[PDB]
Ligand binder design. Structure first.
Ligand SMILES: [Mn+2]
Ligand SMILES: [Mn+2]
Ligand SMILES: [Zn+2]
Ligand SMILES: [Zn+2]
Ligand SMILES: [Zn+2]
Ligand SMILES: [Zn+2]
Lengths: 162, 162
DNA sequence: TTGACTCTCTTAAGAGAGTCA
DNA sequence: TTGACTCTCTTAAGAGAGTCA
């Protein structure tokens, strides 16, 4: 098995490569009518992506390193968390984009949490709009708002009460 | 089926049958430290479910009627909305449980909205905790809260900024 | 050892359609 | 005509593993 030192070396090589990705400045809603700035380190749209990186899906990538003749591979956003527990409350931990930008690999924009917690950030009012996430959101979720409901609750007769 | 009269007849027969499902009272969080009461009309756990109803999945059912000698079938929660547009902004409209209770077929607990709007209600603070859904929530979403994040944003080196 | 592709899978909110009696 | 089963599919947040040079 890879030692702690070997895992730290994988995290360090990943950070060194991602740190050279193009850094894109994005202005974002924070909630409460305020605007903030996030700096995303974005993997390229097409090959080559960077040393160790390869695309396994339209918005999916993996990081690969060969150590003592053995090939090791990880989901490209999971590398910052290789020294962390990989499950919690019986649920698998997932890399969760606080910036809601899949191509971003900035580890300061990632957290490590259940898929439900991950998804829920899409609708969060944001750090200045009432976020209650213990690991605070960096921005209002892209899907926050009144929604676009086509039809609400209704009945034709009198068979039901709420 | 095709005619508005036929569609209204389907909705009316569906409402009559669902109106005879057992009414189960559920006390629910509203947000803001308040609690409310919902009356769900719950499809039975096992056959027979009611005239026109059949189970296609552990928590999935379909309603079927024979019109003009042809069988017409719908997802069991979609029937109240048969006169509504079936898409919005190019997204499929879905039956969305305001009570977060799949077996419930009370149309006063259903709305018709994109799958994203639908999902997002799981994390809503609720009608007394800050819900901004234009078609208002009936309860705080079951997944609202601080979450259980295992690890937050972090870097080992000095290559990244937020 | 490395790059650039290939494939299928998970989850939890939701769907459509066929086989028998 | 009605009932009671069977199967796979959609979406958008996420995954693992194979092939070839
Ligand atoms: Mn996410
Ligand atoms: Mn729902
Ligand atoms: Zn980012
Ligand atoms: Zn938040
Ligand atoms: Zn209900
Ligand atoms: Zn709401």
């Amino acid at each position: 098995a890879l030692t702690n030192a070997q895992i730290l070396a994988v995290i360090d090589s990943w950070e060194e490569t991602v740190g050279q990705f193009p850094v894109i400045t994005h202005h974002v809603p924070l909630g409460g009518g305020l605007q903030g700035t996030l700096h995303c380190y974005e993997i390229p749209l097409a090959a080559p992506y960077g040393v160790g990186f390869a695309k396994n899906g339209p918005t999916r990538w993996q990081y690969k390193r060969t150590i003592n003749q053995v090939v090791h591979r990880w989901g490209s956003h999971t590398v910052p968390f290789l020294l962390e527990p990989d499950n919690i409350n019986g649920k698998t931990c997932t890399a969760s984009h606080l910036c809601h930008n899949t191509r971003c690999h900035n580890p300061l924009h990632l957290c490590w949490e259940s898929l439900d917690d991950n998804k829920g950030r899409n609708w969060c009012p944001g750090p200045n709009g009432g976020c209650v996430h213990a690991v605070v959101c960096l921005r209002q979720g892209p899907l926050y708002g009144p929604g676009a409901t086509v039809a609400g609750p209704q009945q034709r007769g009198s068979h039901f009460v709420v």
